[PDB]
Amino acid sequence: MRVLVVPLPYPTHLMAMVPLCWALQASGHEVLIAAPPELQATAHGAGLTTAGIRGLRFPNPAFGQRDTEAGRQLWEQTASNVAQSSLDQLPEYLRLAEAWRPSVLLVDVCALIGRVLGGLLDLPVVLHRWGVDPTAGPFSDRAHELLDPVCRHHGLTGLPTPELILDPCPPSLQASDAPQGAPVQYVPYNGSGAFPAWGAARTSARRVCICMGRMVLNATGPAPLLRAVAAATELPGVEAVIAVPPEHRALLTDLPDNARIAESVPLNLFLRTCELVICAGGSGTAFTATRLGIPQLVLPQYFDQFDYARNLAAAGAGICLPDEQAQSDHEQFTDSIATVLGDTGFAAAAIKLSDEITAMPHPAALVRTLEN
Amino acid sequence: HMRVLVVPLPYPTHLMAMVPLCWALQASGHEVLIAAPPELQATAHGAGLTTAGILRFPNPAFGQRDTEAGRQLWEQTASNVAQSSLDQLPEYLRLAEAWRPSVLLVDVCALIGRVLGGLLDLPVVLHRWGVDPTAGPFSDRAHELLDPVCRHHGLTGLPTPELILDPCPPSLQASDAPQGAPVQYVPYNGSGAFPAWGAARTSARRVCICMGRMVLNATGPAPLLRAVAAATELPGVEAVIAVPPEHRALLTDLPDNARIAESVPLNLFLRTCELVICAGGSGTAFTATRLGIPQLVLPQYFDQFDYARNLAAAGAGICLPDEQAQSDHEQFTDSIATVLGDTGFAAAAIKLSDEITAMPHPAALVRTLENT
Numbered sequence: 129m130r131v132l133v134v135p136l137p138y139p140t141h142l143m144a145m146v147p148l149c150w151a152l153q154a155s156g157h158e159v160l161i162a163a164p165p166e167l168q169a170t171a172h173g174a175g176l177t178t179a180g181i182r183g184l185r186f187p188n189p190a191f192g193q194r195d196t197e198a199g200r201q202l203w204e205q206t207a208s209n210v211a212q213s214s215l216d217q218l219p220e221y222l223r224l225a226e227a228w229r230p231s232v233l234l235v236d237v238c239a240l241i242g243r244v245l246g247g248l249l250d251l252p253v254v255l256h257r258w259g260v261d262p263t264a265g266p267f268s269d270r271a272h273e274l275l276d277p278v279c280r281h282h283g284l285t286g287l288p289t290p291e292l293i294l295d296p297c298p299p300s301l302q303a304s305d306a307p308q309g310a311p312v313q314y315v316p317y318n319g320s321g322a323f324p325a326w327g328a329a330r331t332s333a334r335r336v337c338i339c340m341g342r343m344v345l346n347a348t349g350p351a352p353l354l355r356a357v358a359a360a361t362e363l364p365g366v367e368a369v370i371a372v373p374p375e376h377r378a379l380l381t382d383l384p385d386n387a388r389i390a391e392s393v394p395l396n397l398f399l400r401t402c403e404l405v406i407c408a409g410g411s412g413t414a415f416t417a418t419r420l421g422i423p424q425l426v427l428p429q430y431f432d433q434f435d436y437a438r439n440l441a442a443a444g445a446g447i448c449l450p451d452e453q454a455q456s457d458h459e460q461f462t463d464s465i466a467t468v469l470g471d472t473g474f475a476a477a478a479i480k481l482s483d484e485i486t487a488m489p490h491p492a493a494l495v496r497t498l499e500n
Numbered sequence: 501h502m503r504v505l506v507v508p509l510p511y512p513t514h515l516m517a518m519v520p521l522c523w524a525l526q527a528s529g530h531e532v533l534i535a536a537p538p539e540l541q542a543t544a545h546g547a548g549l550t551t552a553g554i555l556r557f558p559n560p561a562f563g564q565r566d567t568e569a570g571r572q573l574w575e576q577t578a579s580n581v582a583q584s585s586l587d588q589l590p591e592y593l594r595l596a597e598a599w600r601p602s603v604l605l606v607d608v609c610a611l612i613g614r615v616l617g618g619l620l621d622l623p624v625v626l627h628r629w630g631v632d633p634t635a636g637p638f639s640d641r642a643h644e645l646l647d648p649v650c651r652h653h654g655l656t657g658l659p660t661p662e663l664i665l666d667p668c669p670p671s672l673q674a675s676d677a678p679q680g681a682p683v684q685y686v687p688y689n690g691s692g693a694f695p696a697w698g699a700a701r702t703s704a705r706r707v708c709i710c711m712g713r714m715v716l717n718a719t720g721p722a723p724l725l726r727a728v729a730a731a732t733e734l735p736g737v738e739a740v741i742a743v744p745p746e747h748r749a750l751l752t753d754l755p756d757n758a759r760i761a762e763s764v765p766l767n768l769f770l771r772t773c774e775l776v777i778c779a780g781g782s783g784t785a786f787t788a789t790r791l792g793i794p795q796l797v798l799p800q801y802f803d804q805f806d807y808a809r810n811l812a813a814a815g816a817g818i819c820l821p822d823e824q825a826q827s828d829h830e831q832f833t834d835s836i837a838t839v840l841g842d843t844g845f846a847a848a849a850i851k852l853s854d855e856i857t858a859m860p861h862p863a864a865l866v867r868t869l870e871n872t
């Protein structure tokens with residue numbers, strides 16, 4: 129196979145596909161990532177090769193509310209944006225496919241250009257979910273409303289149905305309306321970096337990791353990070369491990385002596401020594417914590433994060449702070465950490481979810497499915 | 501579920517030779533950590549991997565192990581590596597105790613991994629990067645220096661490894677290398693971008709000149725200047741020059757039939773080339789051989805003379821075996837012309853490519869490792 133990968137332009141979406149890209153190359157197939165400038169570093173940082181492509185609102189709980197007027201509008205608008213940019217850049221992807229001649233397209237569920245390109249080239253399309261998938265309804269309807277015409281002009285019935293949907297989300301966390309996909313085990317890929325000497329052993333302190341993310345914090349500003357540091361550092365006996373992009377290190381003005389800043393250290397190298405992960409939900413951070421059986425305190429902000437956070441809380445594996453009212457309330461935030469630290473039930477439920485993940489077939493096992 | 505500690509020599513090409521296997525391991529749900537001194541960090545990280553932190557050329561006597569000069573070179577190599585092993589042992593023992601690997605994947609020359617395996621009673625799977633000339637002088641000196649060490653810790657001597665993995669085409673492997681299990685070479689030549697000029701050949705006879713950092717650091721400009729002069733002077737030829745960024749300044753008054761490739765992984769464009777001129781390092785050469793592309797080989801050191809001689813004996817290339825040949829501008833030019841005029845060279849290289857593709861892929865080896 130010659131697999132052309134068509135991700136959304138968000139590092140976290142491409143990172144979710146990295147172990148599969150490796151599974152393919154290790155099984156003797158060829159892989160190329162169509163990457164806008166925003167994804168180049170992510171792609172190359174994973175050892176992969178690319179074809180260049182030119183390319184107070186938070187928290188917003190309406191993203192987790194597709195039945196409301198605002199929820200439906202946000203997901204329609206997301207579809208409209210990706211549909212418009214798909215048309216704008218279709219000439220570029222058609223040139224690429226002519227140069228490289230993929231036999232199959234591995235396409236993020238939200239990267240609609242990949243479905244168009246599949247239709248127009250008569251290439252099979254394997255969609256890939258990055259995690260919780262809330263695109264049924266508003267997003268998917270709007271994608272068809274906008275792209276069906278375009279495909280019908282090319283002689284198709286409309287935007288085609290994909291060959292297969294790969295799904296790394298444990299079923300217990302998946303949106304109830306996401307159509308059934310093909311399970312694939314989440315393998316944590318959090319980038320390269322070095323094993324911290326401290327990351328090997330537990331401490332007598334209560335180790336609480338805060339891991340927010342470049343893309344979240346650029347959207348939100350520093351509040352979720354700083355409110356998390358204030359909640360974690362207040363409780364007696366806690367050791368905060370603050371996992372940050374290099375540029376966010378300076379927001380950290382005054383930390384207790386035992387706090388650790390972990391700059392560009394892949395979470396998975398140390399997270400088994402932590403009792404709680406405080407995060408915004410849904411990305412590699414959260415799935416690595418769930419893979420490793422670590423409960424989470426989730427402050428959702430946008431997209432699929434409210435869904436992930438609710439679903440995690442419902443499974444008993446963490447707590448959700450659902451909106452600005454909750455996340456701004458230092459008492460609810462600190463009480464939430466104390467709650468998880470004082471009830472081994474959260475870790476038990478997180479272990480159950482870990483078991484859901486590890487019972488799914490690994491990316492190496494999915495390569496045969498792609499073949500077929 | 502394995503935890504694999506990878507113990508390479510501090511040379512990037514030897515780590516790159518293991519990268520597809522490392523990715524096969526992580527894609528099948530195992531954990532991998534690369535013990536990396538400073539020299540290897542960026543190669544490891546550039547592959548998406550994680551780390552634990554730790555004259556005169558050409559010299560034909562490397563390919564003359566039945567001579568005194570050849571024995572001394574290989575004995576001095578082993579002496580250097582053995583003393584390093586003793587220097588670094590405390591760090592490796594700390595790391596093993598911290599991270600608790602279940603299996604060591606060790607470069608054939610990284611004697612520390614074998615010491616570590618004996619002392620810790622962990623299985624050692626040795627990994628060849630290609631042609632393995634370590635059987636005479638090298639392996640004897642390694643036993644002379646390290647058997648005592650291992651005897652002080654209660655062992656018979658430096659242990660026999662569990663398994664040797666070998667990606668070298670069997671017809672090219674040194675006759676005295678102990679039997680190793682086949683693993684199919686997967687080209688990995690770093691990350692980078694697919695160049696537009698890499699999609700198709702042109703009317704010209706495209707010759708790639710590809711020499712790595714370690715080789716040019718050792719040799720100086722001479723093998724590069726010699727190849728650029730011989731190639732670009734030949735009627736018909738377009739030279740694609742693939743050298744590390746810091747060696748690009750060596751190329752002045754570049755002719756109009758030369759292109760400097762901008763850090764572009766060989767495998768992205770090599771299928772459009774009719775010849776590769778290289779020093780015989782396994783990543784460049786095995787990528788060429790995998791793709792059925794003949795080579796003109798200017799060996800310099802270590803295993804390069806053996807590969808060069810054996811490739812030529814195969815009909816798949818021409819060897820310039822020493823300085824008098826390599827500096828013979830007429831002979832060099834005539835060698836390029838001879839390959840470009842005789843499709844038998846490419847046909848012989850395809851025979852070798854068939855030995856490679858008969859081997860199981862790295863993904864298939866993960867089971868063998870699981871059983872060890």
Ligand SMILES: OC[C@H]1O[C@H](O)[C@H](O)[C@@H](O)[C@@H]1O
Pocket residue numbers: 191192193194195196199262303304305435
């Ligand atoms: O999937 C079912 C429920 O969860 C969703 O994610 C929606 O946003 C909400 O409209 C719905 O009531």
Ligand SMILES: [Mg+2]
Pocket residue numbers: 670673674675676
């Ligand atoms: Mg043999």
